[model samples]
Target: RCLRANLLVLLTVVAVVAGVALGLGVSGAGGALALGPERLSAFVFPGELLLRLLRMIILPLVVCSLIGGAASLDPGALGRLGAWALLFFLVTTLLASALGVGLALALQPGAASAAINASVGAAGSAENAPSKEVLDSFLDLARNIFPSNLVSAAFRSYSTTYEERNITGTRVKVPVGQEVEGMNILGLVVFAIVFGVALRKLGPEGELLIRFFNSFNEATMVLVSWIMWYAPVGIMFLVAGKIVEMEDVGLLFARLGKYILCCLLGHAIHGLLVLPLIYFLFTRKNPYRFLWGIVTPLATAFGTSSSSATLPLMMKCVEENNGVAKHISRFILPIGATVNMDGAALFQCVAAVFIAQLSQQSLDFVKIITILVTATASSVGAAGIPAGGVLTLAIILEAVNLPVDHISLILAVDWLVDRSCTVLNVEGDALGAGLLQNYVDR
Candidate 1:
């Protein structure tokens, strides 16, 4: 760990502290210190700018990272074992997302905040009315995943709208698929991964394209770090703005507490039960020993809130301490860091439900399914994406028709939740490496 990373983490915490103090302090002072909505927007302007930059970065980040990461893997080199290794990542990540949905459904963290929901105004009838049959909603997910135009997709999300038309004699509502204005990140992800694979098949001739994308991703991360340096400043104002307008302080905290509780509980399940169980079953050996060996990597991930940054330590520990073959450790861990993001998938689902509840948007079978797929896909994109956990949360919520404004409230406590996210994230990575090594050697 470097002094700089530690110092920035410290400053991020300090921003949270300063934000809470400034917000609660002013709100408590009332009349003179109070500002109306417009003034509050002005104060929150920089925070909004931060969100804009984040959204801006997500496109290039997902495109370049997925392309480079996917192209680097040689299928023949991967063969069956490497394929199964990726399958483990996909299976675990999908499971973690479902677990997030399960807990969020059961826990209802968002419902706790009556004070927040009371101010919800009415949900747009337009959004509600178009939501028709179960099948239509399900198909929309499929549509978004295979969008017609990448150009339109970057700014349009797919949805179904019902239009009344006379067929034969009687009037009936017809389901018309349409594009709404928002990034269809799922389609973009599908395209990038597929394109990257095709590049790999392009073989040696494709080396230049792959090299260009790899550097593109590296450049993108450098810019991402620059954004992080500015994050403390943006976060301070975002937190203050959300807190300033808050009606009931106690209820808001109550809501945030369960939001944290529900997500942490989900993280614990995946990390403690699901991951270790998979390791024990696959290798038929002590998984805890493997976990015990990687303590340094886990701790570093927790402290730094980054799985990518912890990769070297995790690699070193897996090889030297956990007895994973250097070949397996080196081969699988990079892809795991990029694709096997179990923790973020869990948190994104939980956060989406909370936001739905925070904004008083209702969740349904279709929406739940939407959240599951969106969360899973975005987390795959999360690897190598700076602020992987948080930026991907933007992608998830944007899919479900929730307003982006409440992200300020969610961002307030993100520095805390993000650590556990990285820990589980790296845990999944190391475990995947060891499990694959054990199988291959046997």
Candidate 2:
């Protein structure tokens, strides 16, 4: 049953290694030219399709889940449950950020990568690093957070263009994008919360709206189930395309492996140790047994690399696997998906520090604090779109005045690390729901 429930995880691992091996062997003089660019693109199409389906469901899921979850809260108990849940999320996210920074600095992934780059003359340059003023202007950052249009913010998507460029006499297609053109998740969350509260106050008049969102939430979850049916095949192509399209696979693993390990290490420590400690203290339950019961949800989270898409599964797991009350799971899990990004927070801290080290920039206490604060802030609003962490990652880099361009450095490893961190992200929500069950009921 264990293997049966999590076959996707095993398949994903096989796909990643197999893809990378083929990608490496297929290169050079007298190689098997079978797995060329066009073929690789075709291979990854299912993964792209899966990602699009997930993205397609995100806006509706968020709006429906948040509104239904919030409006369903017991009238007088909203403030108490809301306060405790938010506090848990905020505190855990901050700790996760601090832990990520400490691990990255100790591991020195940026320095290692920088050394490799120096020897090989990699493309990373100080000139590409954005100035502190351009990325960290308070007015601009704040202005961008508040959406100008609700519809635009809820349905936005980023598009890219590619142009041929000469690099060492080789023509390469370099991708460029103007700006993120899609959904402002932060704005949407704010709107949903306010709308939910208003509905709570309306009581009888709001019953129709509540029923509508509740029905919408159920339908969307069913949609999630349908999307996941294609996951194993889709993920294989996704990982294969990701590996095949890499320009320097060896260099990426050589330098960034330590960094990737550090992030995963931090996530593991937090997910396994810190969260279990909290779980024991709050509920005095056997954390291991709880984890065992929810293995299916965690595995799904790893495969999908999406906390939101996994939210419905998470709710089912919490209740059926661990006996968490439905009311608690409904109320807390949706809110957690929107704001409780422990993994993403941790990743931002590491990425920001790693990027700074790569650029040979000195970061003092103030700058380090900036990373922690911005990571926490930006991570809360991270969308549920595939690789949505990258968008908030840009926000963290910009906040710390690192080169926004350095994003390319870590993009290669994101697919792998995304799965690891998402496991932690989903686990955090489950842990929270379990920990707060008694308090929420009382």
For TM-score, the strongest prediction is 2
TM-score of each: 0.60, 0.77
* lDDT, candidate 2, 1-442, per-residue tens: 8767656446545655565555456543223366666776776687778767776876787777678777877656777887888899888999999999889888788764343343233256523433323233343334434656678767643333355666768786655443356555556766776788889889789999999998987787787666655655665555555555655446666667788889889999998999999988888888888887676557657656777766665665576557887656767787787678899888878878887877677887898888888777766545423335565666555545566655665655677777777888888888888888877655
Residue 41 of model 2 has an lDDT of 71
Model 2 TM-score, 2 decimals: 0.77
Candidate 1 residue runs with Cα over 4 Å from true position: 31-33, 76-128, 167-171, 252-264, 267-442
Clashing pairs in 2: 153-183, 156-182, 156-183, 157-182
Model 1, 1-442: lDDT tens per residue? 4564356556666876787788788788871256877788888887778667656755666676667756665656545656887788878888998998888878878674543642243333212323344455446657767789998877787766788766777888888877777666667767876787799889788889988986876676677666666767776777677667564467545657778888788888999899899988888888777676666556546545656655654555566556776546645675676667888888888877777775567787888888877767666555422523475565455456676555555554676678788888888888888888777778
